[PDB]
Design a protein around this ligand. Structure first.
Ligand SMILES: [Mg+2]
Ligand SMILES: [Mg+2]
Ligand SMILES: [Mg+2]
Ligand SMILES: [Mg+2]
Ligand SMILES: [Mg+2]
Ligand SMILES: [Mg+2]
Ligand SMILES: [Mg+2]
Ligand SMILES: [Mg+2]
Ligand SMILES: [Mg+2]
Ligand SMILES: [Mg+2]
Ligand SMILES: [Zn+2]
Lengths: 157, 138, 98, 41, 79, 67, 154, 48
RNA sequence: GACUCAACACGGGGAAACUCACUAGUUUAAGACAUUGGAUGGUGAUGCAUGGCCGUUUUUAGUUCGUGAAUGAUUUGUCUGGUUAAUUCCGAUAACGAACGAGAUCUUAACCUGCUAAUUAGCGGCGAGUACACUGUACUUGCUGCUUCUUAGAGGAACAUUGUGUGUCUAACACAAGGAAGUUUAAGGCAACAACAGGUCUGUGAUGUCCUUAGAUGAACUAGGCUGCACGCGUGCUACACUGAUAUAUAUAACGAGUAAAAUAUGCUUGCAUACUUUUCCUCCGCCGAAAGGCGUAGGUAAUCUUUAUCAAUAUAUAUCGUGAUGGGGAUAGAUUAUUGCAAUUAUUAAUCUUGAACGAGGAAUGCCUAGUAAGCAUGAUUCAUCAGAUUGUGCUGACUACGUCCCUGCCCUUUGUACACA
């Protein structure tokens, strides 16, 4: 017997844990999922228990690990996003990056709403920290998805 | 026969059941003789005085109060009475009389019919109260 | 029947569906009664450090408990419950005479 | 200073003013006359 | 403690084989593993050893250790 | 208490297309707006209606400088 | 003192239609007259609750307390000792640290209750919860209230 | 070994084993910074 | 660690141990893998190596692009003016047109549907009584149309609507009526661009390098210290009384929050082993106890029980004081009785008795605030084994004064000057 409040929190915690586990495991995957080769994963979960932004971020991280010219990679990513039908994007990469000191680099394409509950709704955001030569490079990707309609527009027929 | 309306001041909902009867007027299980403090007693009696004590010999009234402090409760009770009597008149007595009563109430003041919409604003961090921040010495 | 959940609209939809199911036949269904939403509030202080004018942030996980009654046999109620449904809305059926 | 005593238009303050007395004594006097704020004539 | 009985070790290995994976819990003074009542420290040590040889692959999440068995490891377990 | 370009723009758009439907009556105007344009809010919609009404008032007594 | 021109009639039937403090006083007086309830031993040098840091200063405070308790019982269905204590709570100034609310010394209350039950005014109900009024006691209380009302009218 | 059962050093964050600043309400047992990051996934939305 | 705003009840930091990084010492391998190489751990070093997150610039209104126009950096757009809470609009115009920011959106709180629903909420309905009124009222047990109150989903309602002023009679403002409401209704949340060499590696198994690695700066244990005190500066609490203390009596909140250790029996030498079951958190209630608390039991994994048709204090009413460092004031101290915990001394906290200090409204300075606000009064929660004087919510009593201005202070703008650009 466990109370409702207690249960809910516990469930949330479990969800979080699962997510983290997935992140740890699947560096080679276009990960989003969270709905329940894979046999091992299932076993692990049992033991424990008794277009998208995250994927893009992961891809970026992988690219960084591989060792590209950075800017080019970012551009490619942006292009991909555009192809996948995004109204707007934004990527940031801050960290060490070539020089020792500082250096945050923005990469926007289409328009990116930041403030309001629309932002909360109509953007998928993701954050990965790609470990590299002499520290960490800091990805953050932010995608504005196709709307189910924005509050700013007033479409007269 | 029997009519149920509420008052409302802050939190403090006084629900006035106004029925056919002899003219007693009560609170939960107690007469309006009590209320509590002698000073504020007039704020409860005022609508009755305005309307006339003979008009309420046809109407019994019970009032159930819940929530709030003292003064707020009194106000709520008053409001309930004001809404109550008028509501009764609108249904089971004539319209002209009701109108007259309403006019009288308006002449005296607001708050009897229409409600006080004020309520305790949320306290904000960096302070004790709503607006009152802490203190900087530099 | 008690329907505990986190997401309001979804819960409402579920309730509606069950009502519809009931209205088929044989079910004296009392209307959906939504219960007092006992909101889990956490007030955490933002900022890992102690720097910056200490802004807090009131999170609220607001659980919606929903309740609904019936005079029926178990199998039928089970069938009714089967609207497919998903991991989000937590259902519990009580099959008591009292 | 004003060390008022005990052994020897009505209000306590007035009484205090007049005969130079503690206000408990004033109260007592008032009571006697009759026989948390006050008013008497 | 630094005892490490042989029989216990063997049992652990068998369990691993049966599963394919072991969720360790990276806790020092927790007595037992959920299923098998073994001193957890010993189990942890064994898993570390396995990892060192690359018989097992590890992906550390919060608190738990989540060890997954490698093909070489499996082969070894054949014994 | 002034109107943004979005509101103003919307108003402009109406009276170009749907001047026929409209008359100096607020409720009617609001209804028309609801029928025509995709305002997600209530308050915003109301505001839009009000501005349309104002625009209408301004015309009949002269040119607006738009539409 | 209390009386005034009101716009209604008062059904002076039960104690809820009586002014409290006066009623309590009257009841205390009645008790004194009777000699129906004692004044144990420790009563005459105890403090009624943590917060009071001082003795009552009323002489026949016990009687008053008893009267109050009776009224409380009448008001509520089933009322414990804890509840009673809570009811007779005050602010405890902790000198320099700010005030807290202070639960009353329950022992005296308990004793009073016991006395009442012995006399046949209150009743530990096996159904429900702790000690309500006994019907005879209630009736007596009502009678007293009526008497008080009559006196006031006079 | 000395009693590690009731005190700040008894239990810890689930996430990063830190003994400081643990949200111990509703048996969450996450140190508050970590909670702040995972408040989305747990289902704690800021409204007001 | 943090040092003007933007360090100083801050690190959720109320540390008896653990926390613990420190001091006096003592253990241990948690030394994988091929005594050696080689990792592994660090509340070690460095936030001037970084990630993320947070702060401030700034909740102000600001940032940018397309094309056009004006060797270059650039400018224009993005403005003389009016208006706005707002680069909010209007109007003028080498610009026209966009996009983010504002606004909208979200969440509450504000008033309705006398439509949607009725428990774990009520209202009645009605039996059963107990008291008293007149020819119904107050109060409990037992049974089961309405939705005003109680809960909470979807809708509605204000748009400056109608009226009248001021305004290029433009954007808009002021007043009046209506109305639940007329300062985007009130309150938040969200938070552009660009930074600051701001903070944080003492939140992290986010993380680089350098150090350390068994006489460890790893972990574990035993004390001790973070609380030590001529003093300076913070944030608070309590006061200086009579609109008050004291003591009785009466009144009445809202947000809440609540589940490895012990008991009893058997077998042997206070210990172990075996068997078996309530207790670990909220406490009703019944008894003991001045008090604190204790013991027994009861409900509650919660709109059901704690408990909430009342858990609080200011309130109010009636008494004692009587302006006297006074019964204002409760510091400092002295001695017990408990509770928490393995452990309470450098007194955890609590209670009981006694001790009766400074303070008679506060100098130079400086903070916060415009309506349910200030202030007062409490109280829930967070920390929590125990401990609010903190924070964070919530309510209750409910002022004064504006309703503006640029005088100071701080930001922003145009012009202007600059030898500054680390500004
Ligand atoms: Mg926007
Ligand atoms: Mg302490
Ligand atoms: Mg220590
Ligand atoms: Mg820095
Ligand atoms: Mg420009
Ligand atoms: Mg906004
Ligand atoms: Mg310290
Ligand atoms: Mg604190
Ligand atoms: Mg200043
Ligand atoms: Mg220069
Ligand atoms: Zn953590």
């Amino acid at each position: 017997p466990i109370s409702k409040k207690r249960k809910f929190i516990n469930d949330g915690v479990f969800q979080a844990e699962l997510n983290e586990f997935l992140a740890r495991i699947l560096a080679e995957d276009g990960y989003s999922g969270v709905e329940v080769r894979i046999r091992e994963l299932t076993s692990l979960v049992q033991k424990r228990f008794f277009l998208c932004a995250m994927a893009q971020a992961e891809s970026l991280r992988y690219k960084l690990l591989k060792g590209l010219a950075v800017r080019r990679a970012c551009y490619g990513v942006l292009r991909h996003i555009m192809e996948s039908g995004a109204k707007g994007c934004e990527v940031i990469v801050s960290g060490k990056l070539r020089a020792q000191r500082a250096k945050s680099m923005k990469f926007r394409d289409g328009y990116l709403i930041s403030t309001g509950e629309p932002s909360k709704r109509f953007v998928n955001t993701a954050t990965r920290s790609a470990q590299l030569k002499q520290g960490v490079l800091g990805i953050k990707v932010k995608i504005m998805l196709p709307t189910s309609i924005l509050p700013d527009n007033i479409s007269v027929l | 026969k029997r009519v149920q309306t509420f008052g409302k001041k802050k939190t403090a909902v006084a629900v006035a059941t106004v029925t056919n009867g002899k003219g007693l007027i009560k609170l939960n299980g107690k007469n309006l003789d009590l209320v509590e403090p002698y000073i504020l007693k007039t704020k409860v009696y005022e609508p009755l005085w305005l309307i006339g004590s003979g008009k309420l010999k046809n109407l019994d009234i019970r009032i159930r109060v819940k929530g709030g402090g003292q003064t707020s409760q009194i106000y709520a009770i008053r409001q309930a009475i004001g809404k109550g009597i008028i509501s009764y008149y609108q249904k089971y007595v004539d319209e002209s009389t009701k109108k007259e009563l309403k006019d009288v109430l308006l002449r005296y003041d607001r708050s009897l019919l229409v409600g006080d919409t004020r309520r305790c604003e949320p306290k904000k961090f960096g302070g004790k109260g709503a607006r009152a921040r802490y203190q900087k010495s530099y | 029947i008690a329907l505990t959940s986190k997401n309001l609209r979804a819960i409402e939809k579920v309730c509606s569906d069950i009502m519809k199911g009931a209205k088929e036949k044989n079910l004296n269904v009392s209307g959906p009664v939504r219960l007092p939403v006992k909101t889990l509030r956490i007030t955490t202080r933002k900022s890992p450090c102690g720097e910056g004018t200490n802004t807090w942030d009131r999170f609220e996980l607001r659980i919606y408990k929903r309740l609904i009654d019936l005079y029926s046999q178990c199998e039928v109620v089970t069938q009714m419950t089967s609207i497919n449904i998903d991991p989000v809305v937590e259902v519990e059926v009580i099959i008591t005479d009292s | 200073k004003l060390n008022h005593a005990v052994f020897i238009v009505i209000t306590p303050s007035a009484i205090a003013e007049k005969y130079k007395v503690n206000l408990s004594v004033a109260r007592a006097v008032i009571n006697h006359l009759a026989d948390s704020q006050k008013l008497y004539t | 403690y630094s005892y490490i009985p042989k029989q216990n070790k063997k049992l652990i290995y068998e369990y691993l084989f049966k599963e394919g994976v072991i969720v360790v819990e990276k806790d020092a003074k927790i007595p037992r593993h959920p299923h098998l009542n073994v001193p957890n420290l010993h189990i942890m040590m064994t898993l570390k050893s396995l990892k060192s040889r690359n018989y097992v692959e590890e992906k550390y999440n919060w608190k738990h250790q989540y060890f997954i068995l490698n093909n070489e490891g499996i082969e070894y377990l054949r014994e | 208490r002034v109107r943004t370009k979005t509101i103003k723009r919307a108003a402009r758009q109406i009276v170009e297309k749907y001047y026929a439907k409209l008359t100096l009556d607020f409720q009617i105007n609001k209804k028309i707006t609801e029928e025509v344009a995709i305002i997600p809010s209530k308050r915003m919609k109301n505001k839009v209606a009000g501005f349309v009404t104002h625009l209408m008032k301004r015309i009949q007594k002269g040119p607006v400088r738009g539409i | 003192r209390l009386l005034e021109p009101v716009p209604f009639v008062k059904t002076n039937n039960c104690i809820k239609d009586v002014d409290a403090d006066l009623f309590i006083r009257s009841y205390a007086t009645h008790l004194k007259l009777h000699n129906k309830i004692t004044y144990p031993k420790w009563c005459t040098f105890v403090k009624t609750g943590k917060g009071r840091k001082l003795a009552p200063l009323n002489e026949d405070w016990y009687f008053i307390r008893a009267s109050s308790i009776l009224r409380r019982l009448y008001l509520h269905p089933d009322i414990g000792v804890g509840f009673l204590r809570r009811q007779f709570s005050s602010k405890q100034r902790r000198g320099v640290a700010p005030n807290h609310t202070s639960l009353a010394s329950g022992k005296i209350l308990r004793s009073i209750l016991q006395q009442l039950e012995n006399l046949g005014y209150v009743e530990q109900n096996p159904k429900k919860k702790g000690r309500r009024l006994t019907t005879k006691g209630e009736n007596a209380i009502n009678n007293f209230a009526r008497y008080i009302n009559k006196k006031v009218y006079n | 070994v000395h009693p590690k059962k009731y005190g700040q050093g008894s239990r810890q964050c689930r996430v990063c084993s830190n003994k400081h600043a643990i949200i111990r309400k509703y048996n969450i047992n996450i140190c508050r910074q970590c909670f702040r990051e995972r408040a989305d996934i747990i289902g704690f939305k800021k409204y007001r």
